[PDB]
Nucleic acid binder design. Structure first.
Length: 297
RNA sequence: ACGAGAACACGUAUGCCGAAGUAUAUAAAU
C-alpha cells in the first residue's frame, strides 16, 4: 500500500460537462481509464491490472500537508453553515473531525488556509474554417484550466499485491508523459510523480472502527446493493461521456450513462464493486472502475 | 477503453498632424 505524489507545473483541464469548465481533482473512473489506455498503448497485458488492483480517488495536498474528502457524517449540533462550506479536512485533524472535536473558528481558519490553486479561462480560436481563404468568422472558444502553487499537487492511494504494485509503478513511469486530463494534445496536463510513505496516513489507513468512509467512486454489484443500503449516507453522481476508438463515428459513439456513489459516502455494510461494462454496439468492451477503498473509522 | 476527440485570440491599419532657438543691450574708458 503506497501513495503516489503528483506535481504538475503546467495547467490542467479536467472537465465536467464542457471544455470551459475547470475542476481540481479527478475521479477513479478517469484514473483507471488512463491507466488502461496507457497499458494498451504500451502493449502489455491487462488481466493483471484489471481484477486485482484497487485505486482511490485523487486528493489535493499543500506544502507539507495532505487532505481527504469531508465525511458525510451526521454531526449533531446549530451552525450547519461553516461546515457546509468545508470541502476537505487535513489529515492531522481527521480523527478530531470524526469525533466532533472541530470548532467553528477552527473550521473558519482551515477554510482560510486552504488555498491550493486558482482557476483560469484561456480563450482560443480556430481558423480551420473558410477564414483561411474567404470571409468567415473566426470561432472563439474557451477552456477551463486550474493551476497549483509550486508546492502543491495531487496524490493517490493504491493497494494490492506487490507484483501489481510494481506493474502500476512501471505504467505510471510511462504515463507521466501522457496526460491526465482534457486537452492532452493541446498543451495541458503533464506531471512528475514520486513515491512517498507517510506515517500518519498509514496509521489512518489501518485504523479499526465501526463505520466506513468511501474514498473512491463505486457501485455495488446487483446482488449486494440490497444489503449495502441498510444505513447509508451517500450522494450519487452521474458519469457520462464519449469513448476513444470504439467505432467509426466519435460523434455517434457515446458511453451509456452510469451512476455511482461519491467519494465521501458512509456505509455500514461493506460491499465489493466491479468493473462494470458500459458498452453496446461496439467492437471492444469499454470499462468503468467501481471498486471501493475503505478507511475504517 | 480519460465529458474525451479536430481547433494559430486571429486578419486589416502608426507617434502622426502644425509649429524659426527666438526677441532686446556699440569690446569702453586715462
Amino acid at each position: 500500500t503506497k501513495v503516489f505524489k503528483l506535481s504538475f507545473k503546467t495547467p490542467v483541464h479536467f472537465g465536467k460537462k464542457r471544455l470551459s469548465d475547470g475542476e481540481m481533482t479527478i475521479t477513479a473512473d478517469t484514473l483507471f481509464s488512463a491507466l488502461f489506455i496507457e497499458t494498451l498503448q504500451l502493449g502489455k497485458d491487462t488481466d493483471w491490472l484489471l481484477n486485482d488492483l484497487i485505486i482511490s480517488d485523487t486528493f489535493p495536498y499543500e506544502n507539507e500537508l495532505y487532505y481527504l474528502p469531508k465525511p458525510l457524517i451526521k454531526i449533531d449540533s446549530d451552525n450547519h453553515k461553516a461546515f457546509k462550506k468545508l470541502k476537505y479536512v487535513p489529515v492531522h485533524h481527521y480523527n478530531q473531525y470524526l469525533n466532533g472535536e472541530l470548532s467553528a473558528e477552527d473550521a473558519t481558519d482551515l477554510n482560510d488556509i486552504f488555498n491550493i490553486g486558482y482557476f483560469s479561462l484561456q480563450t482560443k480560436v480556430s481558423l480551420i474554417a473558410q477564414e483561411t481563404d474567404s470571409s468567415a468568422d473566426s470561432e472563439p472558444y474557451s477552456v477551463g484550466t486550474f493551476t497549483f502553487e509550486p508546492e502543491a499537487g495531487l496524490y493517490f492511494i493504491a493497494k494490492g499485491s506487490e507484483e501489481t504494485l510494481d506493474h502500476l509503478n512501471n505504467i505510471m513511469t510511462a504515463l507521466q508523459y501522457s496526460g491526465l486530463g482534457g486537452k492532452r494534445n493541446a498543451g495541458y496536463g503533464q506531471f512528475e510523480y514520486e513515491i512517498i510513505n507517510n506515517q500518519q496516513l498509514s496509521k489512518l489507513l489501518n485504523q479499526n472502527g465501526k463505520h466506513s468512509i468511501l474514498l473512491s467512486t463505486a457501485m455495488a454489484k446487483k446482488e449486494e446493493i440490497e444489503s449495502a443500503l441498510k444505513e447509508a449516507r451517500y450522494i450519487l453522481t452521474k458519469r457520462s461521456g464519449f469513448v476513444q476508438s470504439t467505432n467509426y463515428s466519435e460523434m455517434l459513439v457515446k458511453k451509456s450513462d452510469f451512476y455511482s456513489f461519491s467519494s465521501g459516502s458512509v456505509f455500514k455494510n461493506i460491499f465489493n464493486g466491479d468493473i462494470f461494462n458500459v458498452g453496446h454496439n461496439g467492437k471492444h468492451p469499454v470499462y468503468r472502475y467501481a471498486k471501493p477503498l475503505w478507511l475504517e473509522v
